[PDB]
Scaffold this motif. Sequence first.
Motif, PDB file in Angstrom:
ATOM      1  N   UNK A 158       0.828  -1.195   0.000  1.00 14.13           N
ATOM      2  CA  UNK A 158       0.000   0.000   0.000  1.00 14.13           C
ATOM      3  C   UNK A 158       0.876   1.264   0.000  1.00 14.13           C
ATOM      4  N   UNK A 159       2.009   1.243   0.743  1.00 10.74           N
ATOM      5  CA  UNK A 159       2.921   2.368   0.704  1.00 10.74           C
ATOM      6  C   UNK A 159       3.462   2.619  -0.719  1.00 10.74           C
ATOM      7  N   UNK A 160       3.796   1.564  -1.441  1.00  9.00           N
ATOM      8  CA  UNK A 160       4.286   1.768  -2.806  1.00  9.00           C
ATOM      9  C   UNK A 160       3.168   2.288  -3.699  1.00  9.00           C
ATOM     10  N   UNK A 161       1.943   1.820  -3.484  1.00 11.28           N
ATOM     11  CA  UNK A 161       0.811   2.443  -4.206  1.00 11.28           C
ATOM     12  C   UNK A 161       0.666   3.902  -3.831  1.00 11.28           C
ATOM     13  N   UNK A 163      -7.437  12.274  -3.353  1.00  8.75           N
ATOM     14  CA  UNK A 163      -8.281  11.599  -2.357  1.00  8.75           C
ATOM     15  C   UNK A 163      -8.119  10.092  -2.415  1.00  8.75           C
ATOM     16  N   UNK A 164      -8.535   9.501  -3.528  1.00  6.33           N
ATOM     17  CA  UNK A 164      -8.305   8.079  -3.763  1.00  6.33           C
ATOM     18  C   UNK A 164      -7.142   7.640  -2.855  1.00  6.33           C
ATOM     19  N   UNK A 165      -6.094   8.435  -3.004  1.00  4.33           N
ATOM     20  CA  UNK A 165      -4.830   8.526  -2.290  1.00  4.33           C
ATOM     21  C   UNK A 165      -4.881   8.535  -0.737  1.00  4.33           C
ATOM     22  N   UNK A 166      -5.833   9.253  -0.146  1.00  2.00           N
ATOM     23  CA  UNK A 166      -5.983   9.175   1.321  1.00  2.00           C
ATOM     24  C   UNK A 166      -6.384   7.806   1.817  1.00  2.00           C
ATOM     25  N   UNK A 167      -7.276   7.127   1.091  1.00  3.28           N
ATOM     26  CA  UNK A 167      -7.692   5.811   1.509  1.00  3.28           C
ATOM     27  C   UNK A 167      -6.502   4.852   1.341  1.00  3.28           C
ATOM     28  N   UNK A 168      -5.628   5.075   0.343  1.00  5.40           N
ATOM     29  CA  UNK A 168      -4.468   4.162   0.170  1.00  5.40           C
ATOM     30  C   UNK A 168      -3.483   4.330   1.350  1.00  5.40           C
ATOM     31  N   UNK A 169      -3.242   5.591   1.715  1.00  3.88           N
ATOM     32  CA  UNK A 169      -2.373   5.929   2.819  1.00  3.88           C
ATOM     33  C   UNK A 169      -2.960   5.326   4.087  1.00  3.88           C
ATOM     34  N   UNK A 170      -4.266   5.431   4.286  1.00  2.00           N
ATOM     35  CA  UNK A 170      -4.811   4.862   5.505  1.00  2.00           C
ATOM     36  C   UNK A 170      -4.774   3.343   5.535  1.00  2.00           C
ATOM     37  N   UNK A 171      -4.908   2.692   4.378  1.00  2.17           N
ATOM     38  CA  UNK A 171      -4.734   1.236   4.287  1.00  2.17           C
ATOM     39  C   UNK A 171      -3.337   0.827   4.699  1.00  2.17           C
TER      40      UNK A 171
END
Lengths: 228, 228
Positions: B125-128, B135-143
């Motif tokens: 998830x960090x590499x993503x 935003x899409x991006x905030x959910x990835x960071x939180x994952x």
Amino acid sequence: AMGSMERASLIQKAKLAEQAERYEDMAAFMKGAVEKGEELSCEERNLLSVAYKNVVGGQRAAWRVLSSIEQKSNGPEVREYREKVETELQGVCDTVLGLLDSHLIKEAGDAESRVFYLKMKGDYYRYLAEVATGDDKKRIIDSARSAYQEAMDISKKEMPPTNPIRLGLALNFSVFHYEIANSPEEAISLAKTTFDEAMADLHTLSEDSYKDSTLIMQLLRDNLTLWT
Amino acid sequence: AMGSMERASLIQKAKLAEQAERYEDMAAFMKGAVEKGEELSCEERNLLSVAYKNVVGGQRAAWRVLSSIEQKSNGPEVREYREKVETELQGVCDTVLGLLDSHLIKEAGDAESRVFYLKMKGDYYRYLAEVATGDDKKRIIDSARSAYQEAMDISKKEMPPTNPIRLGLALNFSVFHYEIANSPEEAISLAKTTFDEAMADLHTLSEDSYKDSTLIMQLLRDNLTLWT
Ligand SMILES: COc1cccc(NC(=O)COc2ccccc2P(=O)(O)O)c1
Ligand SMILES: COc1cccc(NC(=O)COc2ccccc2P(=O)(O)O)c1
Ligand SMILES: [Cl-]
Ligand SMILES: [Cl-]
Ligand SMILES: [Cl-]
Ligand SMILES: [Cl-]
Ligand SMILES: [Mg+2]
Ligand SMILES: [Mg+2]
Ligand SMILES: [Mg+2]
Ligand SMILES: [Mg+2]
Ligand SMILES: [Mg+2]
Ligand SMILES: [Mg+2]
Ligand SMILES: [Mg+2]
Ligand SMILES: [Mg+2]
């Protein structure tokens, strides 16, 4: 799969892929560029060669590792995986040889281009020979020899002894003699004569040409040191 | 495509591919092994991680080169080729995350295995997140955060402070805070506390365990030096 991309965009992307060290991509972009049907410029020929030398280089390094493990082992897994890598290597060599035959060599009329492509043909048959066995194998070795010889004949007629393509061709043909043809004396004679005739022609060069030529002469010297 | 190969042969070939530095092959063999459905041993988990870290590593290095060129440029070619590399990187991360979700994490009951896989989930998830926008991006960071946090919670309960998986997890979560979450103070606090509590536990270790742990503690120290 590169049929829909502009020739200029394929060349630009090959250069980006080189910066990114993405050599598989680089090769695919340059294969696409060749397949546009137009001759390649000096710079473009060099992009083609760098791309494929890095791709096949990774394959040859892996094949050597695997072959070593296999021969020291001598289940089916090592042989199987060595054969997988071998087949992929053969495929890349066949691809390059295909681009050369369809139709780079036939349209190459200037010495710089014709010698470049015949050297490449010798090099990719040489990589096929490294993994080949038996008879099939003799015809591959002779294909490499034949390409290198034609390149050498043109290079000697049309290029000065310091020309870097002529030098690189002689270097690789010497490696062919030492490693493939079991002809170390021919390897050493070729590397020696090439080095000496280049040395005698250096005085004609600018500073930048001198740097180009002496770089390759040092590779000839390195081999001679390894071989004697 | 590895469905017809024995689990043991896939593992053996992954080890050969690692020797040969053929990391794409290594990853495909380990993906095949995971897809056999059996849990992975410590050694096998490490083969999985090495394979994918090298594959995604090459992609992240290329993406960084391309992103730099693109931002200094700011035709469509640089963006297009950066997007191509980005999509392939995303695909590899999605593949890894898929293996973790189907069904490595759910079957992992021991702390060493569960922490290992949750760390991997945080890392991919960090590499993503590195390539994500908005935003899409905030959910990835939180994952990524959520996976690392679960791993940290288990590691603190179940493993000594010198355990190399616990140390590596803390190291990577500190990198997540510094590089992704814009939380350099949290990064520095985590790396500091992890280093100090490991130092205090070294006395309990054999010579070989000591070497394992201090190697990772030196990486924490290297970051702290870079960050302060
Ligand atoms: C480019 O990656 C690899 C992989 C495996 C072997 C090599 N080649 C070498 O180490 C030395 O090879 C040469 C030396 C002088 C001239 C030509 C070659 P070559 O790579 O066999 O075309 C390169
Ligand atoms: C493995 O290949 C690459 C490519 C691009 C970046 C990196 N990573 C680095 O240079 C440093 O990254 C880290 C440092 C400490 C812990 C974790 C990492 P990371 O690679 O981001 O998981 C590695
Ligand atoms: Cl195989
Ligand atoms: Cl012609
Ligand atoms: Cl592209
Ligand atoms: Cl469980
Ligand atoms: Mg056009
Ligand atoms: Mg074969
Ligand atoms: Mg012509
Ligand atoms: Mg001339
Ligand atoms: Mg079975
Ligand atoms: Mg995108
Ligand atoms: Mg279980
Ligand atoms: Mg415990």
